[PDB]
Amino acid sequence: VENPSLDLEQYAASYSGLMRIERLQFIADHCPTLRVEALKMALSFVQRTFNVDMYEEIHRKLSEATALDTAWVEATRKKALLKLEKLDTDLKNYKGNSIKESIRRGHDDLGDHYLDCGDLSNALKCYSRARDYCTSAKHVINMCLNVIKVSVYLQNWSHVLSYVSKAESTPEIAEQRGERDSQTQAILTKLKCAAGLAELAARKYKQAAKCLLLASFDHCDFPELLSPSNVAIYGGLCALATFDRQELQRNVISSSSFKLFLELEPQVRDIIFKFYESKYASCLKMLDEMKDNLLLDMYLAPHVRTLYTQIRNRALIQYFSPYVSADMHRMAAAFNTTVAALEDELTQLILEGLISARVDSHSKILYARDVDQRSTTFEKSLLMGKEFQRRAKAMMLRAAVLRNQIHVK
C-alpha cells in the first residue's frame, strides 16, 4: 500500500485546531512508509496550542520510528497552572459582581482555555453550567456550535443530533420569517453540516446525504467543522450510493447551489456524470483509483467498504433494469470483471430478490423472468387455507383437552 499523490500541506492548510492534530494522528496510524513527513510537520507546527500528552505520544512514536525536551514541559505546566489560577480568580470576581454578560463571556473563555489544555469533560461540564445564564438566542446558537464541536470530539452522536434539533427549535423555528431572505451570518449551514456529519457517523446515509445536500457555498467558508472539498466528497458518494435515479436527477445533478461543490472536486463530478449516463467501466475504474486516497480520511475510514459495495450493487441493478435478456460477456467486460466473479455476484444477488433474473450458463445469457400473478395467488391461497385448516384442527383438540382438564402429575 503506497500512495505518493497525497498532499499533507493541503491537509494542514485546509483544517485548523485540534482537528488537524487528530487527522495527522489518524494518517500516521493508518498510512505507513509516509510517516516521516507527517510527523515532521506535526513536530514543527503542533508545538503550539499547549501540547502536553499528545506531545509525549508523538515523542514516543518518533522514538519507535527511530536532545530530550523536558524543561519546556514543566514550563508549560506552570504557565498553565498560573493561567488557571488567574481564570479562577477572575471568575470568582465576576460571580461576585453578578453580571450575566461578563459571567457568560468568562465561562466561554475558560471553556476555550480548557479545550486548549485538553480537558474535554471539564469544558463540557463548564458549558453545561454556563447554559443556565442564557439571554439571547444568538448566544445560544454560538454556545450550541461550541458544544457540538466538543461533543463530536467526544463521539456522542445521539446527543449531537438531539442538540442540533433543539438548536433548530430554539429561535422560534428559523425566526419564523427566514432572517430577512436568508441570513448573512448563516450559522444554519454550519448546523446542517453538523447534523449531516453526525448522521453519517451514525450509519444513516440517506438522512446524512439529504441534510448535507442543503448547503450554500458562500456560507461554507468557515473551516471549523468541515471543509468544502470533503463536504463535496461525502455528499457525492453518499448520494450516489443511497438515492435512486429520480433523486439522483432532481437533487445532485440539477441543483444549482451544489454544482459549485461539484466544481470544487472535478473527479466526483466525473464519477456522478458517468454513473448517470450509463457509463460504468470508467466510473468503477475512477472509483477504484480514488479508494486509496479516500481511505485516508479520518471520518469516512470505517465506511468505505460498505459504501463501495452499495454503489456496485446499485450499478448492477440499474444496468440490468432495462434489459430482458442480456449477453453477460459484455456485462462482464463493461464491469471490469471476469465471467466467474460476475456469475458469483449475480447468483448472490438473485437469491436476495433484488434482481428477478435467471442465468443460463451454457451460452452465458442472463434472462429476465416475470412472475405470473394467477399461479402465485392460487398457490399462496391454497397454502394459507391448508395452514388455517391445520391450525383449526389443532386448536379444537386443544379446546377439548382443556375441557377435560388434563395435566401431568
Binding site: 435515479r245 433494469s321 432495462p322 442480456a326 400473478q373 395467488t377 399462496k380 394459507m384 395452514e387 383449526a392
Partner: protein
Amino acid sequence: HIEELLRNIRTQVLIKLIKPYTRIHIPFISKELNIDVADVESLLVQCILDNTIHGRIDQVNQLLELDHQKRGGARYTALDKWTNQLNSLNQAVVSKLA
C-alpha cells in the same frame, strides 16, 4: 446547446414511431433515426430508464419488446390482499386461548 438539441428531436421521433409496434429490429430503428446501432441502444436505454418508453431491450437478438400486455388483473392483487389479512385474522383468533 446544439448537443442538448438534435437529441430531443430524435427522442420525439422514436416515441412517435414506437407507438403502434410491439416488437421490432434495432437496425430498422437505426435506418430511420440516421445513427449507428450503439447510439440507438444508448437512446433506448436512456428513454427506458427515464420511464418514457414502456418496454424492454433484447440484446441477443437486438429486439425491442413493448408492453401491449397487463390485462385487468388488479382483481388478483386484491384477492391476495384477502390472504394477507385472513391468515393474520385466524392467527389472532387461535391466540385467544383455546
